[PDB]
A paper describes a structure:
CPS of Hib consists of polyribosyl-ribitol-phosphate (PRP) repeating units and represents its most important virulent factor. Here we employed a Fab fragment derived from the full-length human CA4 IgG, belonging to the non-A2 family of anti-Hib mAbs, for cocrystallization studies with Hib oligosaccharide DP2 or DP3. Crystals of DP2 and DP3 oligosaccharides complexed with the human Fab CA4 were determined in the orthorhombic space group C2221 at 2.29 and 2.74 Å resolution, respectively, with a single Fab copy in the asymmetric unit. Our study demonstrates that the minimal structural epitope of Hib is comprised within two repeating units (RUs) where ribose and ribitol are directly engaged in the hmAb interaction, and the binding pocket fully accommodates two RUs without any additional involvement of a third one.
As concerns the OS fragments, unambiguous electron density was observed for the entire DP2 length. In terms of antibody-saccharide recognition, the total surface area occluded from the bulk solvent upon the formation of the Fab-DP2 complex is ∼870 Å2 (360 Å2 from the Fab paratope and 510 Å2 from the glycan). DP2 is accommodated in a Fab small groove-shaped binding site delineated exclusively by the H-chain complementarity determining regions (CDRs) H1, H2, and H3. The long 16-residue CDR H3 (according to North annotation) is likely oriented to shield the epitope from interactions with the Fab L chain. The DP2-Fab binding affinity is the result of contributions mainly arising from polar and electrostatic interactions, involving all major saccharide functional groups. In further detail, Rib-ol A′ establishes two direct H-bonds with a Thr28 backbone and a side chain (CDR H1) through its hydroxyl groups at positions 1 and 2 while its OH groups at positions 3 and 4 are water-mediated bridged to Arg98 (CDR H3). The phosphodiester group between A′ and B′ is not involved in relevant interactions with the Fab, while the Ribf B′ interacts with Gly102, Thr31, and Arg53 through its OH-1, OH-2, and OH-5 groups, respectively. Moving to the most engulfed RU A′′B′′, the Rib-ol A′′ is stabilized by six direct HBs with CDR H2 and H3: the OH-2 group is within the HB distance from the Asp99 side chain and Met103 backbone, the OH-3 interacts with both the Ser33 backbone and Asp99 side chain, and the OH-4 group makes an HB with a Met103 backbone carbonyl and an Arg53 side chain. H-bonds of the central phosphodiester group A′′-B′′ are established with side chains of CDR residues Arg53 and Thr106. Surprisingly, the crystal structure of the Fab CA4-DP2 complex clearly showed that the antibody participates in a groove-type binding of the DP2 ligand using the three H-chain CDRs and without any involvement of its L chain.
Residue numbers in the entry:
A (entry chain H): 1 to 138, 141 to 224
B (entry chain L): 1 to 216
Write the structure that this text describes.
Amino acid sequence: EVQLVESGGGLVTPGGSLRLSCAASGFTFNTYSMNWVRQAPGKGLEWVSSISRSSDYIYYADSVKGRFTISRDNAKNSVYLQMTSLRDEDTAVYYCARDPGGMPTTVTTWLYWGQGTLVTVSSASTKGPSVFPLAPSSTSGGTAALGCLVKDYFPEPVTVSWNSGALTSGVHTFPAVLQSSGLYSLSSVVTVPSSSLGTQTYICNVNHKPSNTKVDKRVEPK
Amino acid sequence: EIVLTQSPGTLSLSPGERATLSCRASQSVTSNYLAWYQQKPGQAPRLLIYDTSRRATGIPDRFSGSGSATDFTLTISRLEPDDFAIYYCQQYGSSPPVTFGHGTKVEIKRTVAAPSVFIFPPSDEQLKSGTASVVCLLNNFYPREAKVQWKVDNALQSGNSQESVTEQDSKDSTYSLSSTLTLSKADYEKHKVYACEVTHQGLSSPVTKSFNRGEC
Ligand SMILES: O=P(O)(OC[C@@H](O)[C@@H](O)[C@@H](O)CO[C@@H]1O[C@H](CO)[C@@H](OP(=O)(O)OC[C@@H](O)[C@@H](O)[C@@H](O)CO)[C@H]1O)O[C@H]1[C@@H](O)[C@H](O)O[C@@H]1CO
Ligand SMILES: [Zn+2]
């Protein structure tokens, strides 16, 4: 089983530095080039840097030369990316990637990807969200709606589940929007039959990991 | 650098039909080192094709790549609702600068479905916090295009609402949309009627969901 797992991302002030890690398993690590590829929020993909199997050949994109340093340890099955003098343009999900195998050079195309770690470059301070209930009222064809408003948080991301994951049908968790104040906001809604409001309780499980925030809010009819 | 231009920008087709995607390069790509990715929202890219025509392992035969030099083609036959994604092309025959296309977004077409509309007054908890948000929900509709307008005491609003849309549903290929109106707590208590007016191809006339600030 081939697995890549990035780590180390987070909030960093402009001009600061951050070190990213990527552990690998499921293949002979020492026979493969390793690569870092990033994707800014809402945009496409951009290759960052790569390193050959024994660190003899190191390549960078022009946008990171003199600022980012790639390295690897074949005994730890790990490739690293040391970032310095970070800019707003560096805000992206950073992916660890590996080629399909048998490729002719260090930088080609990538078959395996990690989950990616989010790097946010901004001087704005960390803030956990407020979780407000969206109460169901009193009915389109017998359908009611409820939800939770996750307002004013920074940075991304937050996750939302319902009834600790047991409730999934009819759930619509919307992508966050950036308000003018610089803080994010999102809603997660569920549609249910009206009579189920009397025979089932609805709790939204909001998680904002960047601030160690865990909020469970019971949503009830007004 | 070698510039890759993908066309069309967006593609909308029915299940079972064939999608043809183009990737044009500003320079000749050496030895046909051209790849194709599929990326669903929230996930890492999925390698479909590399070396122009070689399918990645586990990729079905409905994904086929072709072309050479400056013209490359990805063909997705027998389209599934699973295929809602953006598709990128990526060349790697140049000198280290490897480039990506800007993507072709593929939507799965289905029959027109009108939305069910709901409106949420700001919670008493949020009004306790000094801010007021009014949310309007559109659920299980198609196509994506929809007009949502806020009226406060019959006065049309502008510039004070933000929308967010979900990805196309895996099963029924529908969308859901939210519109959030922001206003001060003072002005929220200064008006009575808050209405959300929705226009959509599945509605003969616009639908209005509303409440008065004294409901329960
Ligand atoms: O050093 P780099 O940066 O290397 C770039 C690529 O060639 C590798 O990343 C890799 O894809 C090769 O396949 C790998 O090496 C084996 C051949 O030496 C291939 O085996 P393979 O033939 O693909 O068979 C098995 C593999 O597919 C896989 O299942 C296995 O490894 C899992 O445990 C595969 O493992 O650059 C190379 C390249 O320019 C040249 O070889 O010289 C440089 C010396 O540094
Ligand atoms: Zn570009």
